[PDB]
Paper text:
Proteins are exported through a genetically defined export gate complex consisting of three proteins. Here we present a re-refinement of the original FliPQR data to higher resolution (3.65 Å) and also the structure of the equivalent SctRST complex from a virulence T3SS (3.5 Å), revealing the high level of structural conservation within this core complex between flagellar and virulence T3SS.
This positioning of the complex, in conjunction with the observation that it exhibits helical symmetry, suggested that it seeds assembly of the axial helical components that culminate in the flagellum or needle. Re-refinement of the original Salmonella enterica serovar Typhimurium (S. Typhimurium) flagellar FliPQR data using RELION-3 (19) yielded a significant improvement in the resolution of the density, as estimated from both Fourier shell correlation (FSC) curves and the level of detail visible in the volume. We have remodeled and re-refined the coordinates into the new volume, and although there are no substantial differences, the level of confidence in these coordinates as accurately representing the biological object is clearly increased.
Numbering used by the authors:
A (entry chain A), D (entry chain E), E (entry chain B), F (entry chain D), G (entry chain C): 43 to 245
B (entry chain G), H (entry chain J), I (entry chain H), J (entry chain I): 1 to 89
C (entry chain F): 5 to 262
Write the structure that this text describes.
């Protein structure tokens, strides 16, 4: 039984981190690292830790509501998780329904051949999750691609200047990297980035 | 997120890039032409005789221009990072 | 948790494979910037919407013959993914041949290290034209198309046909056609500069295009690329519609020929 | 199995691909893109998708014969993995043997020192593949050289017309760059290439 | 319960190392290897080990405090981590607070809208960790940008000497990899780097 | 003892492919495509496949010998690494001592401060592997240097012809790709290579 | 303790591999193949294996001491806590001290702000490792710098000759690679390198 | 690997390459001189007047010589690739 | 991290680079011009005829410069790496 | 490790390089100059007329010099890689 057990080692925690956040923040930082030259920040520890810390920050009120409403009577273990799920899904759902764009909801309600819903809370979870994740991908890319442009402009300017002199055989990616560090720490570029990512998220 | 905004992004990007790069490149071309005229008329020309002044000119012009070439990027990256939460909405 | 249910869980694996195939092969839409456990997360979520309402009841017999069936799905997924990327390859090719006419193209010689010419322009036009998908719909049209293929070309004995793979393989094709159609004015204007610098050589051979040419043509190739930004907005609308018609046509053509 | 199984699975997709085709196609596409300057196509995506679609089209009849003569009869009766493997190898063998040069078989029979062989299909499976790959490499480089010719002619005429007037310094590598694309699509070049790689395969 | 157990097994080895050090050092070394031409020192093996050893050297006093205050009562196992994590948090709390910028604490409090903050332990951990990591990143990129400058001087003076006398074709990234090894053992730069990163760290 | 077990697995195939062959073959191929301009071949598939087939065939005699010696009594799995090391090594040992320069072993016996050196087993396993690999690298670089000469001939001919006509600015490194390709397919230059790497190997 | 086992499988190999040797060697090969143009060796397969074998031969006395004084008595399994780690480190201490620069231990005794440190065994573990590593990297960069010089001679020579005849067009990095192989197989440059990395190491 | 055999290889390869490139640049130089001399005696010159004949001359000489220029290479390349297993040992 | 301090670091590095690079390319330009003026007045002008003197000149100048051109780097990199712990705050 | 021993290394390497590449470019320059003088006084000159003798000259000079150039490198690389285990300390 090496197969069935071991596949769920990453499956379940990844799904639990797909529900709420940590799906767009990784992507923003990964796009940053795709810019800014080479990796220059090891994913295996640094980006994962950072993007998990920011999520534990942003979702603090959510975990607080869960802790009070469901976690605390779960210390009694009153009921198997039925309202624990529900009274814990409702903060999760209300947090999720706030970020899911409109088109995605309608589309994935069509693809399931569902019936007309009267309330938003009536939207089943198996319909919400993929719409939420799709919306989050299509906003994470909307932020990330808007982050690049200055970096690519510096790249283009440096390359044009180098070729203006006669230096064909230089890898201008190696002269770019320092300027793309000074124009990152010089505009306080990290604080702006994280304040944006933490504000624009909930709003 | 209307295709007018997406194209305005590019129209601003390329204008900033031109504003940055055009002074340097124009100094390079100016030095090139000034020496190339002296290159003929007293015909002497080996091959370059001019890449060295094309380095002197850029090295001077970068120090002379300096501050506002920084200020452009500083302003525009700041406005970008500030408007990011409203691009989405 | 015993193997009783795992074999019931084995019911979803075929649509799962198809959807993972469609996801893995359309990266610029969903790419390596994403962790492979999120890029795989989307699969098992999406199939849970799709897996019910499918009359799909199959069996992996001893020394499975349905391994041959695994041949079918990966093709259709690929058939969608590797097809949808011509809307990006066209704009990338339009971007490259512009920059290669001013200063970037001195990787013409033997293979240098990294490209260093791509990152100049073709990484911006691929980015804009990647934002324009997300304003209309990135995967939504594609996932609906694949939901339709779940109905037309369901599962089973008659796997696929031919003569449609040849259709969309002769299709692009239009990669270079659209590549021209975009950049034709820029390229036409720059050819005139490249020939105009020429007529100076006949007057004085000391003008040594390394001395005059590139500092001149680089500024102009940035100017014209700034002035021709808005034209990219209505053009991309074609590159999307043409290829979506292509896809729908071939996907409807394939099953009736079974 | 524990160890050999996973390694064999990882090796499999290279084995199936090399055995049949797709080692002759990608080289031609690479050489094409090497003409006309820089890549001008995103290798890992496009020139693999196209080069896989052509291969599946060209090899559809082989798979049809394999299906009809192996799967449908092996189903429900009359074959147990012995006549199936045989009647499936024979069409693929006849596919390869049609393409191998006559010398390469002799060479790899000499160095491997196989005894008296009587049947072409009786040539063991192991002896088939490497001679096939070498022969196809030769044919692929042949096709690529046939491709390069008109672009060379274009470059030569353009460079000459330049130097006929006095353009010694101007690097004709730039001027001759759009003409290649114009006269590769104006004559609908791409369809000719898939046509040739489809006809000249079996002939 | 065992689910979140392996969940934590997947993450915690990265969470802990992020919490203390090892996030400025690795990034400084990675920004180093991008200078000096090619990634000479292999990240899979050497930089991880060097950075972990140096961080052990720097964290030895904090580790001593954690030992004498947690493990020695963990020998008895006085209480179930109720104070082992608690008392163990005090040295890490003060340690982070020492290097944590004061403006990042302010900003990340503003994003959460917290009231009066008076004491050090009035700072909730979910305000520290993100502000801590962003501060460490600011510092790491400051050090990284400052490191580059001499390598840029060497590269540009070499490249401007070459094209001074023809030789437009020599790829100066070949002549400049030795000089970046004369300069870098001649000034003993491998002691100055580790000395500075060890000194400036505590402050 | 779970520690050492899995640690052995991540390397064991890589070392296994070191003990026998496939090193000099892959190095020759790697130095082949360095001529002929660009790679022009997808190392992922073609070069590794060829190198695997060639080494399989070259090793087939000693591989079948190892099969008979070990794997046939290994039907019972007789002894875990006692004579499978011996009846695997004596074939390996003869295979390398047929291939290893007698002077390399002299050097690697000098530094080891050796005494009695009479038989192959008197030359311990730890001594052969490095000497074997050093010899193999020397042979592979000999072959690789011998390869480059006709391509140099072609390139210099073309460059001199261009410079003679007054073609001062045409990049002859780009003209000379189809000529190398044709003058390499004409001579049947792929049979000779995989024949020489098979004859010069065993000896 | 399930946690520490996988964290061990992750880190501990990289730790033990940095703790003895194999750090000075790999950097040398990596700087070597930076000369000779292209990779010229598949590091995933060849250089890493060779560098592991060289160390497996060099540390024969240390590994023999470790075996005979730890694991032969560990068949009893007397104690796996004190003399498993403490007694096993006694040879490593000497092996690392003998190759550790003197100025380094001074610096890392100064920073740690210790009192009277006379005994190298009284030198705690944490002061030893990073000083040893910095020293090793210094000497490896020294050897690597001394390597590059003849290759630079050849490349500057060829470039100067080419520019002399007017051959601006030619990419001199393509003509100088066969000569870089000739000058490296002619002087037996491969025996001398391993001989040097084996003799100078222990001293 | 004696530095003598690696001189024999070079002495063969140099002469083979010379044998190849001989007639091409010989007729190139011949035509160049023949035209440039006639740039006297009605001296008038624009810039070159002499690239086209250098092209038609090489175009003639290539097809004239041809097959044996190919044969030289085809022979000695076969020789090298057949002698490979002896230079090793 | 005001753009004044970064400007100071930049102006320091550019002065170091000027000091490193002045004699080499200065002598290069000087000898090149001195020969090129000889290309006229005895009109003989092959293509370069001067890449070799530009090599011998740099060969002489690097030998003559030698120690202090390296001492500049040795000192400035030393002060840089010593002031590093004081740029953070 | 002092800048003195590294300057000794430099004085060795640059002298080896000069001795190695002297005859090639010397005969190149000499043939080129003597021809370019002939290109005056009978002024005839199309463009090059002189690259061919520059090929013949280097072709002869490599063959003549040959073994001792190679022996230089075989000796000095030997001394370098044999002193290698002492440059450490």
């Amino acid at each position: 039984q090496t197969l069935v057990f071991i596949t769920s080692l990453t499956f379940l925690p990844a799904i639990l981190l797909m529900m709420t956040s940590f799906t767009r923040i990784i992507i923003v930082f990964g796009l940053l690292r795709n810019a800014l030259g080479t990796p220059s920040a090891p994913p295996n520890q640094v980006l994962l830790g950072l993007a998990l810390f920011l999520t534990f920050f942003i979702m603090s009120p959510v975990i607080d509501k869960i802790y009070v409403d469901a976690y605390q009577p779960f210390s009694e273990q009153k009921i198997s998780m039925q309202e624990a799920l529900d009274k814990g899904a409702q903060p999760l759902r209300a947090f999720m329904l706030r970020q899911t764009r409109e088109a995605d909801l309608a589309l994935f309600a069509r693809l399931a051949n569902s019936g007309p819903l009267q309330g938003p809370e009536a939207v089943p979870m198996r319909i919400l999750l993929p719409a939420y994740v799709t919306s989050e991908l299509k906003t994470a890319f909307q932020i990330g691609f808007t982050i690049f442009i200055p970096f690519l402009i510096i790249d283009l300017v440096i390359a044009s200047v180098l070729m203006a002199l006669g230096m064909m055989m230089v890898p201008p990616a190696t002269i770019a990297l320092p300027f793309k560090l000074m124009l990152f720490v010089l505009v306080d570029g990290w604080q702006l980035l994280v304040g944006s990512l933490a504000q624009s998220f909930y709003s | 997120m209307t295709p007018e905004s997406v194209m305005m992004m590019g129209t601003e990007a390329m204008k900033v890039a031109l504003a940055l790069a055009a002074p340097l490149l124009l100094v390079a071309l100016i030095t090139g032409l000034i020496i190339s005229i002296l290159q003929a008329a007293t015909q002497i020309n080996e091959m370059t005789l001019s890449f060295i002044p094309k380095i002197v000119a850029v090295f001077i012009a970068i120090i002379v221009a300096g501050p506002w070439m920084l200020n452009l990027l500083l302003d525009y990256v700041r406005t970008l990072f500030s408007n990011l939460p409203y691009i989405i909405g | 948790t015993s193997e009783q249910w795992l074999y019931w869980l084995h019911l979803y694996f075929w649509p799962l494979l198809r959807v993972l195939a469609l996801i893995s092969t359309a990266p610029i839409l969903s790419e390596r910037a994403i962790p492979k456990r999120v890029k795989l997360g989307l699969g098992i979520m999406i199939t849970l919407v799709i897996a019910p309402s499918l009359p799909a009841n199959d069996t992996p017999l001893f020394s499975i013959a349905a391994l041959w069936l695994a041949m079918q799905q990966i093709l259709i997924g690929i058939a969608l993914g590797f097809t949808m990327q011509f809307a990006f390859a066209a704009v990338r090719t339009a971007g490259e041949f512009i920059g290669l006419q001013m200063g970037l193209s001195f990787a013409t010689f033997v293979d240098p290290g990294s490209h260093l010419n791509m990152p100049v322009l073709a990484r911006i036009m691929d980015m804009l034209a990647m934002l324009l998908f997300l304003t209309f719909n990135g995967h939504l049209w594609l996932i609906s198309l694949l939901v339709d293929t779940f109905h037309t070309l369901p599962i089973g004995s008659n796997p696929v046909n031919s003569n449609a793979f040849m259709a969309l393989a002769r299709a692009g094709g239009l990669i270079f056609l659209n590549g021209l159609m975009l950049a034709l004015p820029v390229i036409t204007l720059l050819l005139t500069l490249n020939l105009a610098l020429g007529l100076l050589n006949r007057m004085a051979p000391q003008l040594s295009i390394f001395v005059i040419g590139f500092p001149l043509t680089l500024t102009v190739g940035i100017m014209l690329m700034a002035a021709l930004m808005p034209l990219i907005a209505p053009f991309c609308e074609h590159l999307f519609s043409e290829i979506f018609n292509l896809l729908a046509d071939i996907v409807s053509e394939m099953p009736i020929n079974n």
